[PDB]
Design a protein around this motif. Sequence first.
Motif, mmCIF file in Angstrom:
data_model
loop_
_atom_site.group_PDB
_atom_site.id
_atom_site.type_symbol
_atom_site.label_atom_id
_atom_site.label_comp_id
_atom_site.label_asym_id
_atom_site.label_seq_id
_atom_site.Cartn_x
_atom_site.Cartn_y
_atom_site.Cartn_z
ATOM 1 N N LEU A 184 0.853 -1.765 0.079
ATOM 2 C CA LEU A 184 0.082 0.465 0.099
ATOM 3 C C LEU A 184 1.215 0.889 0.480
ATOM 4 N N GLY A 185 1.879 1.436 0.613
ATOM 5 C CA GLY A 185 2.702 2.368 0.539
ATOM 6 C C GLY A 185 4.307 2.034 1.076
ATOM 7 N N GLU A 186 5.335 2.595 1.134
ATOM 8 C CA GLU A 186 6.328 2.901 1.675
ATOM 9 C C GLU A 186 7.031 4.563 1.900
ATOM 10 N N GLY A 187 7.940 4.072 3.251
ATOM 11 C CA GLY A 187 8.169 5.031 4.111
ATOM 12 C C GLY A 187 9.277 4.632 4.341
ATOM 13 N N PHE B 173 10.353 4.623 7.571
ATOM 14 C CA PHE B 173 10.252 3.422 7.978
ATOM 15 C C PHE B 173 10.021 2.012 8.215
ATOM 16 N N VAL C 73 4.103 0.074 4.470
ATOM 17 C CA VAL C 73 2.406 -0.767 4.444
ATOM 18 C C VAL C 73 1.926 -1.398 3.264
ATOM 19 N N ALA D 212 -4.441 -3.786 7.043
ATOM 20 C CA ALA D 212 -3.108 -2.926 6.656
ATOM 21 C C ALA D 212 -2.287 -3.752 8.183
ATOM 22 N N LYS E 6 1.732 -2.830 8.863
ATOM 23 C CA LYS E 6 2.604 -2.397 9.334
ATOM 24 C C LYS E 6 3.807 -2.754 9.300
ATOM 25 N N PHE F 86 -3.441 -2.787 11.153
ATOM 26 C CA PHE F 86 -4.532 -1.727 11.185
ATOM 27 C C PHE F 86 -5.662 -2.208 10.838
ATOM 28 N N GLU F 87 -6.724 -1.750 11.088
ATOM 29 C CA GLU F 87 -8.364 -1.319 10.261
ATOM 30 C C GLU F 87 -7.464 -0.847 9.078
ATOM 31 N N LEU G 66 -7.060 1.052 5.850
ATOM 32 C CA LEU G 66 -7.887 2.503 5.770
ATOM 33 C C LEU G 66 -8.386 2.819 3.659
ATOM 34 N N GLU H 223 -0.362 13.111 3.631
ATOM 35 C CA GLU H 223 0.079 11.735 3.410
ATOM 36 C C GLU H 223 -0.262 10.947 4.630
ATOM 37 N N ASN H 224 -0.030 11.571 5.718
ATOM 38 C CA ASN H 224 -0.929 10.693 7.020
ATOM 39 C C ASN H 224 -2.089 11.102 7.021
ATOM 40 N N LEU I 87 -5.352 9.761 6.222
ATOM 41 C CA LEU I 87 -6.840 8.888 5.046
ATOM 42 C C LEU I 87 -7.695 8.625 5.224
ATOM 43 N N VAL J 131 -2.989 9.082 10.739
ATOM 44 C CA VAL J 131 -2.242 8.315 10.466
ATOM 45 C C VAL J 131 -1.020 8.222 11.505
ATOM 46 N N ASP J 132 0.058 6.932 11.396
ATOM 47 C CA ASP J 132 1.743 7.468 12.092
ATOM 48 C C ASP J 132 1.982 8.619 13.006
HETATM 49 C C1 LIG Z 1 4.443 6.138 4.106
HETATM 50 C C2 LIG Z 1 3.624 4.972 3.885
HETATM 51 O O1 LIG Z 1 2.205 5.513 4.629
HETATM 52 C C3 LIG Z 1 0.806 4.219 4.158
HETATM 53 O O2 LIG Z 1 1.387 3.732 3.052
HETATM 54 C C4 LIG Z 1 0.480 4.146 4.641
HETATM 55 C C5 LIG Z 1 0.754 4.319 6.467
HETATM 56 C C6 LIG Z 1 1.134 4.951 7.497
HETATM 57 C C7 LIG Z 1 1.752 5.038 8.188
HETATM 58 N N1 LIG Z 1 2.241 4.504 8.838
HETATM 59 C C8 LIG Z 1 1.289 6.263 7.302
HETATM 60 N N2 LIG Z 1 1.219 6.949 5.597
HETATM 61 C C9 LIG Z 1 -0.858 3.760 6.946
HETATM 62 C C10 LIG Z 1 -1.129 4.267 8.215
HETATM 63 C C11 LIG Z 1 -2.757 3.410 8.737
HETATM 64 C C12 LIG Z 1 -3.205 2.572 7.851
HETATM 65 CL CL1 LIG Z 1 -4.668 1.629 7.912
HETATM 66 C C13 LIG Z 1 -2.553 2.578 5.974
HETATM 67 CL CL2 LIG Z 1 -3.672 1.563 5.075
HETATM 68 C C14 LIG Z 1 -1.316 2.957 5.834
HETATM 69 N N3 LIG Z 1 -0.637 3.575 4.789
HETATM 70 C C15 LIG Z 1 -1.413 2.979 3.606
#
Ligand SMILES: CCOC(=O)c1c(/C(C#N)=C\N)c2ccc(Cl)c(Cl)c2n1C
Length: 333
Positions: A19-22, A24, A27, A41, A43, A93-94, A96, A144-145, A147, A176-177
């Motif tokens: 779903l995403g990369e950071g 850390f 996810v 989800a 992390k 996580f739930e 999102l 990006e934080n 959602l 989030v985050d």
């Molecule tokens: C920086 C990459 O963050 C995400 O990819 C991300 C992130 C984060 C984190 N940590 C930050 N955007 C998520 C946090 C909770 C949930 Cl449920 C989801 Cl689906 C999240 N995703 C998709």
Amino acid sequence: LICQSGDVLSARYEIVDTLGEGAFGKVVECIDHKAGGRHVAVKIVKNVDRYCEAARSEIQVLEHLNTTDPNSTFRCVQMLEWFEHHGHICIVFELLGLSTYDFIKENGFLPFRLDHIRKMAYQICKSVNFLHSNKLTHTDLKPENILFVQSDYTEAYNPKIKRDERTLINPDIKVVDFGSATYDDEHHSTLVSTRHYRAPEVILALGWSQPCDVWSIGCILIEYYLGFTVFPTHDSKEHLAMMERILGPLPKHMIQKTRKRKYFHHDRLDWDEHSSAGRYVSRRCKPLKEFMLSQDVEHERLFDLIQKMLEYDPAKRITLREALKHPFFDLLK
Ligand SMILES: CCOC(=O)c1c(/C(C#N)=C\N)c2ccc(Cl)c(Cl)c2n1C
């Protein structure tokens, strides 16, 4: 193949998508084989000390917030469980939907409609105010934080702009985050926030607290309204020059206090308007209210709120408790 699609975590969660990369880690979306194939989800944090530490801190914060607010009234993301997998902390996580950044980008950087901005802004301020009421600062607020709960949308031709436009069915969000979130009585990192959302007290290394989140929210709101940042820079001095063009001169007391002497000459920004970078800033930035797309009362009130959030002096900046009472938000009530 560990932590890649097809891997199974804690004997039940099968990775099916990233779903995403950071910084850390990543996810991923998983199928939960012990709960009827429902998706969650996860992390997955790098096995690198500073990220492990941050993840442990996040878990602690989420256990506090999720115990105080078990139904996520205040719209922080719900942690379902956590575990370790081959040296990686994993937080479930739930699931999102898309981030507010991804939705804007996928919509071709069209801004959100004002009625959606009002609902999203209120939710963000309620959420972050809940943190502030619990002696916490997020420190990394950005689109990006934030959602969407459900990113389903309808598409309609918009004859004003002569393109197809997506509109969310439901603009509800969660924050989030929490890996950077800091309690009042804990160590405060020198440098916080992602640059375009970073408060001037941070840039100037004056010290920060809850007000730095309020500056970040003001920056987010501008972005939702315009579909682009007003601070298109990757340099600290230039960022400050952009602030001066948009918001007016930095307060003298802040300039006098800072040790960032490279940015200043006498007690003024050391900035040559006639340089190439000066021309760039002059071309891209202008006084805040010049960015308004309408002079109607709802737009005027949004910009009054943003201007209060972008007050330079953190001691004078609007608090989110005060923001939640601002008249921009009345059409919600
Ligand atoms: C920086 C990459 O963050 C995400 O990819 C991300 C992130 C984060 C984190 N940590 C930050 N955007 C998520 C946090 C909770 C949930 Cl449920 C989801 Cl689906 C999240 N995703 C998709």
